[PDB]
């Protein structure tokens, strides 16, 4: 009953640490849902990856939106899309925001990097962008999460903060502060400086050893597990493909994998079996 | 080098047993190519399932073609698409055949069942024998690449009609131009396949899917003279397995520490995406 | 404003004779709204044609839905889509309906011909109309059932037997079609229908019959089915032939709209104002 | 004879060639039935028919699909107005590949900044590499890359129109589209004097349309693009037909001023399908 946009809104603004898991297609979206996660992360790298292309705007934004439409169709929990820089200027970003709203997607995460191709995009430009998105939403609960690439690009806390504040002031519903460092330093230094001006979102891929409660004490609002399903999937597929190739039989894979009937259950095949008995004449 | 259509055509007509592996997206199509496989099976179940829908004509034929376009861009070996019934009558089938050729797809597999399902131990009626035969012919008459392949999937055994139907249909489709016949069975044993091969007298290449009777020694297929085997959906199933387990572990743990060393690295993904080429090209084309 | 679905339902249930005009792409949808029409008919023949294909389900349903997404994005009045037979069985229909809602389309018209002169089984099609009514999430989304009995050669008995089956199944309106050059089939149906539900007609073949005669018969709505497409084609043919021969633009430049008119139709204006506000000076 | 080959031949030929604009499958077939040897897939025309603005709103794959349909409905080549390639050199090459597979004979690219951040034009050096990048990726040697120079539209001199034009020609361009917003061919005449027949030249005489055609043959121009007239003509017929039916609530005043339904079935090649249904359905 609760709108997906709204569910994501509540998680960002909640005073408790929330988690969203990555998914990259309709199938993974259902699995993340059944597992119990309260939200899905539409990973830009995972989506371009499963398509077999590079994470550098190769697939058009509409090809990415369609993958997300199928993902949205197969889940009841909100999906926060990793939308790069919005695939163009403020106009492309607002057009994207309206299409996602209509597809059932709950929010979009935009970063302040240059597009296409450590200078980044102008703060005022990217601020006007968030604001454009914010002024274009037809659903007040759709979320725009601003991602600051200051630390990653080599700038200091100063650049980060200045950016986060400009974005939060433009209307961002949350700030995703990232760091490629192997520990949470840029983040702890940010958390102190931030002053809790708004919910903060982190991607602990590189400092994954840092305990999670440490994120609770820093006041962090939401954590993103960024790409582990794509990575888990590739390993399993590489393994099974090698296994079958070498064996020239299925004897060594059949019991190490999900049955065909578990596939049908995930596709909700029974609902159709039942609709067909009710809708197909005698 | 050699056209993908030609590579698939040579596999279908070769004397030895050939194998093709299931892929359902660009990523899995590259992994299959890397493993050494000489071809890819564009599984209908695997494609619809990754999209999250049922294997019953929900995604449009152009949404399926699009998934396959990515698969073909990411692989050098032929892809044989499971094209259900051609998505309509003979006219929809030839239009599909033209789009697949243009997309780099090597062939299409069409099955003789009714479409769409209009009716809810009596055998299940299939398509009219003369009608399906003409659809195969319409496709052969329409393809622009002489080596594109039309594989005819016979549903007789599965639908409850014995060997008698299976052979009349296979003969009718082969005679209509099919490049190969795919004989399937509901059984957990190869008996239907065995009986058909015995009666077929090698009138044309035969393709099979050992999914339900997987314990059957592979050498036995070679003895029947089967031309190709299709490993139908195991990459999709291994993926579900891996994603269900990785998700549950991170959900429970609320940390990555217990999965980080059981999945490939992010750099492995970059290599599958051929990130290196982009690097080298931006060096050659960016001021 | 009010929901497009609701606008269409009110027009069908209205006691006034309503009119919806054919559009086949984003541009034509926009022109139809500006003219004043309270609704748009997403003609199956027009969409197919503009794409350069036959009206025999050659382009796919998602390709047709995308054309309509652009049309819906470009208009404020409801678009009723000609969805042929729903592009498959009941399941394909209910999936289609769901996507049309999400894209802003107001309703869909489904015909009882066989897919891909016998028609689809009555019960089967009725159960399909039902599946759509049971699946739609916007209660105002309109499902229009098109009876092809008269065109199929059958008689008034069939047309009636089928109109009643479909309406009892939940259809929001019945489109009664005839190939005749006079309204004989339509007047006979209306006489024996006893107003069991709103009726929709397409006066394409009997366009000489005064429109007031339909009002008198109690017809709820009329569809101008393909005139903008036919108009666009005869102008493009003449424009192309004139430039081709002349090898010059001097003899067409004054018979066609200026490029400024095109920009206005694109709401290019709103973007300039937007770039003015969102792009840093 | 390949479509790509057919185009290249028109660009490097002796006579002045003409290509007429089309924006969908239906208009492409009309352009062909009329006798034109080529089709101009107008950016303005394609986005307009979709009802969006000519500013990169429709994704590049959405544009490619429209062109795919046009391609299937015509036997003569189509030169596609591809903005700046929809991204950097990489986006540009991917577009070229997909265009070749779709049967498009060529892409026309312009030397401007993308996206808009608003007159500076694209770095001369970068566009040159962009042009090259596309040339190096072709799989068909006869696929044409037309470089459109905006110097004169950007407000630069002839010295800049020739500087860019010569650079893009050395990069690989198959032709040079010199455009001028003047209502006379002065700019075109000036550039033609300067150019020194270093490559085929294409012009868009939309504004200076009173200029006699032989004048263009004289200067040595290789091809003329009738840029947007079928769209404009269509729009006139639609606004008029629509107004006429709205007012009269009848079709008696348009039924004799429009083509017939049979004519539509003919243009759709309906008879070709009847013949097929004949031979392929029991
Ligand atoms: Mg990303
Ligand atoms: Mg299948
Ligand atoms: Mg129709
Ligand atoms: Mg342009």
Coordinates of N, CA, C and O and ligand atoms in Angstrom, one line a residue, chain A residues 44-45 55 82 84, ligand 1:
Chain A
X44 N 25.0 0.8 -11.4 CA 25.3 1.2 -12.7 C 26.4 0.2 -13.3 O 26.3 -0.2 -14.5
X45 N 27.3 -0.2 -12.5 CA 28.3 -1.1 -13.0 C 27.7 -2.5 -13.3 O 28.1 -3.1 -14.3
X55 N 30.9 0.3 -18.0 CA 30.3 1.2 -17.2 C 30.7 2.6 -17.5 O 31.3 3.3 -16.7
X82 N 21.4 4.0 -9.8 CA 22.7 4.6 -9.9 C 22.6 5.2 -11.3 O 22.7 4.5 -12.3
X84 N 24.6 7.5 -12.9 CA 25.7 8.2 -13.3 C 25.6 9.7 -13.1 O 25.3 10.1 -11.9
Ligands
LIG1 MG1 28.1 3.5 -11.2

